[PDB]
Design a protein around this ligand. Sequence first.
Ligand SMILES: O=C(O)c1cc2sccc2s1
Ligand SMILES: O=C(O)c1cc2sccc2s1
Ligand SMILES: O=C(O)c1cc2sccc2s1
Ligand SMILES: [Cl-]
Ligand SMILES: [Mn+2]
Ligand SMILES: [Zn+2]
Ligand SMILES: [Zn+2]
Length: 454
Amino acid sequence: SMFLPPPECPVFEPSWEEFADPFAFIHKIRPIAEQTGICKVRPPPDWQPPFACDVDKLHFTPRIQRLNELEAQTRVKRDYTLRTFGEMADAFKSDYFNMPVHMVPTELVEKEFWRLVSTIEEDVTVEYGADIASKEFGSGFPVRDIKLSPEEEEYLDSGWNLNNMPVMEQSVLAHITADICGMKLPWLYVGMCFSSFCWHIEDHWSYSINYLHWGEPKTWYGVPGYAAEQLENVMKKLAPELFVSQPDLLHQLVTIMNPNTLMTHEVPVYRTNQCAGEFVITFPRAYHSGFNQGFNFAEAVNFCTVDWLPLGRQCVEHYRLLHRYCVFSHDEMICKMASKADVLDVVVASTVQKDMAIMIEDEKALRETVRKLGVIDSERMDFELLPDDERQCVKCKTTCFMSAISCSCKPGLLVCLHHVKELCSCPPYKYKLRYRYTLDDLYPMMNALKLRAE
Ligand SMILES: O=C(O)c1cc2sccc2s1
Ligand SMILES: O=C(O)c1cc2sccc2s1
Ligand SMILES: O=C(O)c1cc2sccc2s1
Ligand SMILES: [Cl-]
Ligand SMILES: [Mn+2]
Ligand SMILES: [Zn+2]
Ligand SMILES: [Zn+2]
């Protein structure tokens, strides 16, 4: 009645041995965790990274948030120090409940959150911090620079130090040379009571991993990848405004929605309270949302394993159908790795090779189709040198790399090979096929991968 908490997600407690390699571990828990979308990981008892900072010298610009179920919010992007924010956040919670903060039960804050967001008369607003690491506000994990203590040095090269995990060698997003700050760098989050993250999935359906450095807990709701489209159908019925087309990536619309509503429509949902010193991991295409119990400080980063590669291709296809902008070119990343085949991890080499083979067969079919439409002239083009906004399909907005069509009639415009009819009204013999590689260039790149993989 009123609120029925979803069942608890899986909780893992790896030994020091299991813990040592994060990628091996994540692959091991995958058959369990991917059925629930999110999972929690408790590090071995003596893994404690040192947290140290001056609460007076760390500044950030707060974001303001209204708390209404089904109301549209925009996804990403006055002044507080960490101390002045903390004083504001503690007083807020203390005055809301007329209690000391540590006596307010987590079960009660959860019940109250879902009451207040549904009640139109209540108009509670809260503030929070969200930003990538910078000079004015940096990682909560140790990084190189300032002389470090021996304990800080222990954690400098940990796999679970979230600065490192993007650039390790069983991850596939490391060798991307393209500028993608939002996606390879950690984000820092300063929470207060009821500050909330709306329902979403990660860019390119990647994994995410979140560490709560300190403070009061963070409450999570998660949905497994296989149920993503069920959730979206429910969302579309109850709030169609969120689904209208949008001019860019800085304009994505998201919302708060009671998990009991999803469960009523037969969408599986799980929950957890993440406490200080614990990790939460989200899997590819797993919807998630939540809210903070009180003043706290968290750090999170996207990442991509060899398991993810085929889904990454399927995601870019889904973006095309939806006319959604890409953060990077998937084919470009694949060819960049093929070109470094001799220094690749051998399991990586093997998995990249399979995706490359599919890429090449799809590209063969597409070029044959546009040839039969009467496009004859062609010229090689180094797509990776063009700014992203100069190589998007006019129609579906996909980031071009393997090929595109141009016409002298519309200087600078491109369509991908799926949308040859959408460029202009000139006859196809006036068009030109721009391509990065010939078929004959591509098969040897693939062979280097096979040899490295053996
Ligand atoms: O974990 C949090 O406190 C937040 C995650 C996100 S994503 C956008 C704003 C926020 S706040
Ligand atoms: O290719 C697939 O179907 C999947 C790859 C991965 S990696 C995590 C969950 C899943 S499901
Ligand atoms: O010139 C052609 O017909 C092709 C070139 C390339 S590159 C990948 C597939 C194909 S098919
Ligand atoms: Cl409200
Ligand atoms: Mn997320
Ligand atoms: Zn297109
Ligand atoms: Zn034209």
